[PDB]
Amino acid sequence: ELQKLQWAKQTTSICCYCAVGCGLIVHTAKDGQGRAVNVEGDPDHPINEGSLCPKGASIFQLGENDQRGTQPLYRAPFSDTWKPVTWDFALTEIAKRIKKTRDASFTEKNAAGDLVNRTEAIASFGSAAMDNEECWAYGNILRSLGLVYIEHQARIXHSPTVPALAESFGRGAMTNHWNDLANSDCILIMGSNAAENHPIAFKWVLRAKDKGATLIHVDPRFTRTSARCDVYAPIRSGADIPFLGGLIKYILDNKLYFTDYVREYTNASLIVGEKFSFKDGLFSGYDAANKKYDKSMWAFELDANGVPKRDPALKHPRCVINLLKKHYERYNLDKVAAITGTSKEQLQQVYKAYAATGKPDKAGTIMYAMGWTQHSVGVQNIRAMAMIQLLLGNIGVAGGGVNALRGESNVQGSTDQGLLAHIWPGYNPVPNSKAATLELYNAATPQSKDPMSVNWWQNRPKYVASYLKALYPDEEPAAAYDYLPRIDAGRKLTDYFWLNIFEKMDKGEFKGLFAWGMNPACGGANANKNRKAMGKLEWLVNVNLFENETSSFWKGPGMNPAEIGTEVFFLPCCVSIEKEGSVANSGRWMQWRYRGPKPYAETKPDGDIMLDMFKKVRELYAKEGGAYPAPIAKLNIADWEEHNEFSPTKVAKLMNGYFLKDTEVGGKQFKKGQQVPSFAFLTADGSTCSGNWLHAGSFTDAGNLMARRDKTQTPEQARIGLFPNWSFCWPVNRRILYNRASVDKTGKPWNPAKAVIEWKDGKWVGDVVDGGGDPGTKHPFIMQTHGFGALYGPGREEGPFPEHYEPLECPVSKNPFSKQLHNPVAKAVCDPRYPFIGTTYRVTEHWQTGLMTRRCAWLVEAEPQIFCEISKELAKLRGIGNGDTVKVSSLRGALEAVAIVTERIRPFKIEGVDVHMVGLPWHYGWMVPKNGGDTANLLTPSAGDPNTGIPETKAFMVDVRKV
Amino acid sequence: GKMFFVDLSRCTACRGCQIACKQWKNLPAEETRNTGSHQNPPDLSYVTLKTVRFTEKSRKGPGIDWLFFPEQCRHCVEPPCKGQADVDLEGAVVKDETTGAVLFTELTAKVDGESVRSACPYDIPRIDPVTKRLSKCDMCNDRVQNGLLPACVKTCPTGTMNFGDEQEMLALAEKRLAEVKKTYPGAVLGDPNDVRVVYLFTRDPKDFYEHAVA
Numbered sequence A: 001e002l003q004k005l006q007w008a009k010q011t012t013s014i015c016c017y018c019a020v021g022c023g024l025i026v027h028t029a030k031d032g033q034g035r036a037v038n039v040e041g042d043p044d045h046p047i048n049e050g051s052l053c054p055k056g057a058s059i060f061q062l063g064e065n066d067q068r069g070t071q072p073l074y075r076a077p078f079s080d081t082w083k084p085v086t087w088d089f090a091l092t093e094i095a096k097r098i099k100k101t102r103d104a105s106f107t108e109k110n111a112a113g114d115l116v117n118r119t120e121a122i123a124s125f126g127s128a129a130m131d132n133e134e135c136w137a138y139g140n141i142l143r144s145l146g147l148v149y150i151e152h153q154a155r156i157x158h159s160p161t162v163p164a165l166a167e168s169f170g171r172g173a174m175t176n177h178w179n180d181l182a183n184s185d186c187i188l189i190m191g192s193n194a195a196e197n198h199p200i201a202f203k204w205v206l207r208a209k210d211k212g213a214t215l216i217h218v219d220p221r222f223t224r225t226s227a228r229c230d231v232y233a234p235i236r237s238g239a240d241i242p243f244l245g246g247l248i249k250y251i252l253d254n255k256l257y258f259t260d261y262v263r264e265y266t267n268a269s270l271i272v273g274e275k276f277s278f279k280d281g282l283f284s285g286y287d288a289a290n291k292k293y294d295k296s297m298w299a300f301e302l303d304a305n306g307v308p309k310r311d312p313a314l315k316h317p318r319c320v321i322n323l324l325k326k327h328y329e330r331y332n333l334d335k336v337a338a339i340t341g342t343s344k345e346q347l348q349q350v351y352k353a354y355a356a357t358g359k360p361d362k363a364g365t366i367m368y369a370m371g372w373t374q375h376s377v378g379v380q381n382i383r384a385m386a387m388i389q390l391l392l393g394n395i396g397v398a399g400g401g402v403n404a405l406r407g408e409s410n411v412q413g414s415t416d417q418g419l420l421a422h423i424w425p426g427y428n429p430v431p432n433s434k435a436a437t438l439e440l441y442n443a444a445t446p447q448s449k450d451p452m453s454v455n456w457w458q459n460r461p462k463y464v465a466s467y468l469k470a471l472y473p474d475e476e477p478a479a480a481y482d483y484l485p486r487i488d489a490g491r492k493l494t495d496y497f498w499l500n501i502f503e504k505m506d507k508g509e510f511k512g513l514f515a516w517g518m519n520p521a522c523g524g525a526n527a528n529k530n531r532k533a534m535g536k537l538e539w540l541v542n543v544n545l546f547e548n549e550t551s552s553f554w555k556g557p558g559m560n561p562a563e564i565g566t567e568v569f570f571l572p573c574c575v576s577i578e579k580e581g582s583v584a585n586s587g588r589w590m591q592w593r594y595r596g597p598k599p600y601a602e603t604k605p606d607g608d609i610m611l612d613m614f615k616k617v618r619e620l621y622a623k624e625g626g627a628y629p630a631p632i633a634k635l636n637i638a639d640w641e642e643h644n645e646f647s648p649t650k651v652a653k654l655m656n657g658y659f660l661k662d663t664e665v666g667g668k669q670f671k672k673g674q675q676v677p678s679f680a681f682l683t684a685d686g687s688t689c690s691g692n693w694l695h696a697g698s699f700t701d702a703g704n705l706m707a708r709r710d711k712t713q714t715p716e717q718a719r720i721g722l723f724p725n726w727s728f729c730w731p732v733n734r735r736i737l738y739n740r741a742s743v744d745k746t747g748k749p750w751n752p753a754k755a756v757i758e759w760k761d762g763k764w765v766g767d768v769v770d771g772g773g774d775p776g777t778k779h780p781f782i783m784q785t786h787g788f789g790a791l792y793g794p795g796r797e798e799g800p801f802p803e804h805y806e807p808l809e810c811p812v813s814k815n816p817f818s819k820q821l822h823n824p825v826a827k828a829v830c831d832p833r834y835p836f837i838g839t840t841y842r843v844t845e846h847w848q849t850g851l852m853t854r855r856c857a858w859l860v861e862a863e864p865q866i867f868c869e870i871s872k873e874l875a876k877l878r879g880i881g882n883g884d885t886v887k888v889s890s891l892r893g894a895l896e897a898v899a900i901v902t903e904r905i906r907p908f909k910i911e912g913v914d915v916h917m918v919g920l921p922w923h924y925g926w927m928v929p930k931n932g933g934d935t936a937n938l939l940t941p942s943a944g945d946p947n948t949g950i951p952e953t954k955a956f957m958v959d960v961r962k963v
Numbered sequence B: 001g002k003m004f005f006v007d008l009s010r011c012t013a014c015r016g017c018q019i020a021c022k023q024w025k026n027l028p029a030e031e032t033r034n035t036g037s038h039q040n041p042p043d044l045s046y047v048t049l050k051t052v053r054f055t056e057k058s059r060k061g062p063g064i065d066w067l068f069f070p071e072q073c074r075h076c077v078e079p080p081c082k083g084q085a086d087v088d089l090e091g092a093v094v095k096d097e098t099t100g101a102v103l104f105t106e107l108t109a110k111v112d113g114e115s116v117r118s119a120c121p122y123d124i125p126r127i128d129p130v131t132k133r134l135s136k137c138d139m140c141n142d143r144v145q146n147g148l149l150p151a152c153v154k155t156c157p158t159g160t161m162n163f164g165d166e167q168e169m170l171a172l173a174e175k176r177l178a179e180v181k182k183t184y185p186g187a188v189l190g191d192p193n194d195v196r197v198v199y200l201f202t203r204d205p206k207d208f209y210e211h212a213v214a
Ligand SMILES: Nc1nc2c(c(=O)[nH]1)N[C@H]1C(S)=C(S)[C@@H](COP(=O)(O)OP(=O)(O)OC[C@H]3O[C@@H](n4cnc5c(=O)[nH]c(N)nc54)[C@H](O)[C@@H]3O)O[C@H]1N2
Pocket: A018, A153, A157, A190, A191, A192, A193, A194, A196, A197, A198, A218, A219, A220, A221, A223, A235, A236, A237, A238, A239, A240, A368, A369, A370, A371, A372, A406, A407, A408, A839, A840, A841, A842, A843, A844, A845, A846, A847, A848, A849, A954
């Protein structure tokens, strides 16, 4: 035995950093009764097999860290010091702030006289870091209290992309999963630095290369990823759509599309209306006054029954595929090479390697993460990726898919639980003020008269009603519908989002903010503005592991605490390894993890903080009345708790759901109190509750499928690494989405040697089939209204086909592809004192704003200080020596950093001028360590895209000077 | 005996290995600063048994050859360092006969530390300026004896770090060298006959570090 581990209890956990979802083994002293003594990899976990990057590998030092918060702290207005306080004090006083703010601000009905039952005077940030049961509980508490301004991380990195995937495939989520990358014949990493940002993914990527795969990195910078790819192709910032449009023209010109797949499974054969046109960078229906499109002008020509007309011969000139060929003929090699800055030989090399996967028995995958997709045409960047993949038949197949890598360990889950302003759990929209009744809310789901089209979203009334039953089980859903807040049908949706919460804050329009598991004073673009703007709050509640730049904004650089009136409650939460619950990884794997050490000092799990806090508000309403009490008083928090504490287990069971009576559904008898076995058995009549329909099938009478640790696989499962008995993925354990597309109309795989599903003897074998039905009886994209993979995407604001519009304002004046320079549906100053393109990105060793990793000695030891990476050319021009101190400045702020002069950064060539890109990490903050530096977000602008409402952190103008 | 095979053609410089070594042993962190590199700590020391060395080499066309070298004691079959130390006090350095591990005991405070480092053809040993103890990678010999992989090997996500019986590892290194040559045709095994840590280099070992090979 090893003395260190000999007397400790061994439990399993899941990494608290990135969305790979690596397994841990935690050893805890006194057979679980004391502190952690060791954290390392779980050798049995099939994603990491024991391996950890330095973030997971250092979780012992994160947890057993004596800089962690120990008890609530209170900061009285204008004080220059924290006073330590009891949980009782903190939470009772926070409950009184909420009540006072709500009673004073609540609006039954807006201007137009519509019912809205909301408060706009309190906003909430966070968090993808909380467990799935905490995320769900959190959303329901904030909405019970009437909040609409409810945002977290997902807004910044995933919101600008998800609608690309939803339009193309019918769902927003990563299409495959990490293990599946090993099955790919060609891996295109584009807007991702996965070797640093998803490091255990490279176990599977280098395994794909062992099996013959070509690895391609397309990045403006040569990275740790780049060092291990076959092909590094530099691209100038914002030239992604030229690159991908050129790949589409290459595929059609050279006839490398998967013809049968394209004919049967995509909307290639659909006939677009005569009103569709495109000329000089504008599609038909353009309103030049409102900078907005009439999308009805893009409608399909519908048959007598209301079904889009198809020409399966693909001859009709208004066939999607024919309009597609015509749209992309402008993206020739010379034009694309000139704008991308990628050599013609290297474009040809990448096009020929990747388009070879159009072969039925070859698979290409695309990995992207955040990259530079933040801007107004990021959604169209991801559309082009989706369309390429559909052309090559790489959707639904092993080694295929669009692997939109999620960032934070549970950003998939936090999004699924609706911690964004526009969604309830399970991607049911938040009602607007015109959705007066449940019947009317339900009236908006489009129907299909195509019998082959499953159009699964028609089942929405079941999910909404089953949802309202888990919150308000004694009310009729129609009645409960009126307790939850509604947004203005009149307002721009982006008015309720991240960037506008900061804009509103800076105008004093908020009394209260919850900074729950986030560090906005470092996370938000233009930190100078947001730090000042946080002054204009009455109260700030911060729930975090450590004191930080947000909790302590009032004593930050250039701040005088005396002048600042904001009252702050700092509530210290427990680490991931000190609590039980589930996190949903990038692959939709919902994984259970267990408590190892008891919470450090007087820290609490988020669930207990939020439950106790709400209970205080409810007891306060039940003593002194106030604005519209019913939503608060009737919420069923009883199903959330067990032995007086937040119960992850009970909340997870409520999320899956259970029958409120004996019921017949899909011709099967179900007893009241039974767990719902799948969302296929939810009802709209109040027979069923489910906190989240996606979670229906996750915790059944069979028990907690998320806590399965079973590596049992049939040979066809093990050949592609599905691991279907390891935890549980939504929907209903379908590991690869769109898998019906992986077989012909008889149920035989395109690639037998890597089958996903196969029809053998009356049954789908391998993965769980994505949509029930015999081979050749259903369109494969069951969440699509029409049931096809959309090459032509007429629900996108920017147009049905991706078109290059220049996202770099400052150094570019001419569009080679059209007369239209910028997105015609979307005021950079470009002050010439700031000639360099600044960009922010990550390193392997630090996490987000560095609030967690700047407290971890081993990670600071490897990356102690903020740096600025620059080319030798820019080094030569500004007289900067390797390691010299530099000043980096913009219109928004300035900071000092260590120059790294490296050949890994090259100047761009834009309209025959050298433009220098300068690279900073955004992992640093003024609180810790000494000499670390401050956030790169001192430099960034808080001007974003009218349509995305997402800030600009990847291309902003700076100067860099030797100091 | 046991052998590491370290395939540097697979390394992402994640520095999982560097952090894992310190987590397993509960080693303190050095005071470091950025002096124009990701590399930190800059060097092995009394409290740093493994550091990932980063080297940028210019190449024709876009990008670089970015060379990563996670440095540790090579657990030499015939340890120079022992030969030097067995002159001041036979006992300070021993060889576990089970594992192959070359181990520095508490008795290294008695010998001339300076002299043992100079004997090491890989410049590996480091001195505690307080206790005059010699410290370095101990092969995680406790874990190995208990049938566990060393911390740096279990943590590695890429398949760079490999550990096992000297027979299986030399077998794997020969078979891996053949496959790797198809991408990095100048790839070589570092001193495969003298050491228990066999590095596969993608080119001139000396490009990875001055003491990459003897
Ligand atoms: N180690 C580590 N891992 C993390 C995180 C962390 O903080 N540290 N954070 C996580 C989170 S929350 C997220 S959302 C993800 C983000 O994951 P990534 O998107 O991989 O993260 P970044 O390093 O910000 O950006 C990726 C790459 O995009 C490149 N890039 C910049 N502009 C362009 C462009 O115009 N085109 C293309 N093709 N590439 C461009 C950058 O040079 C960089 O190499 O990572 C997650 N993982």
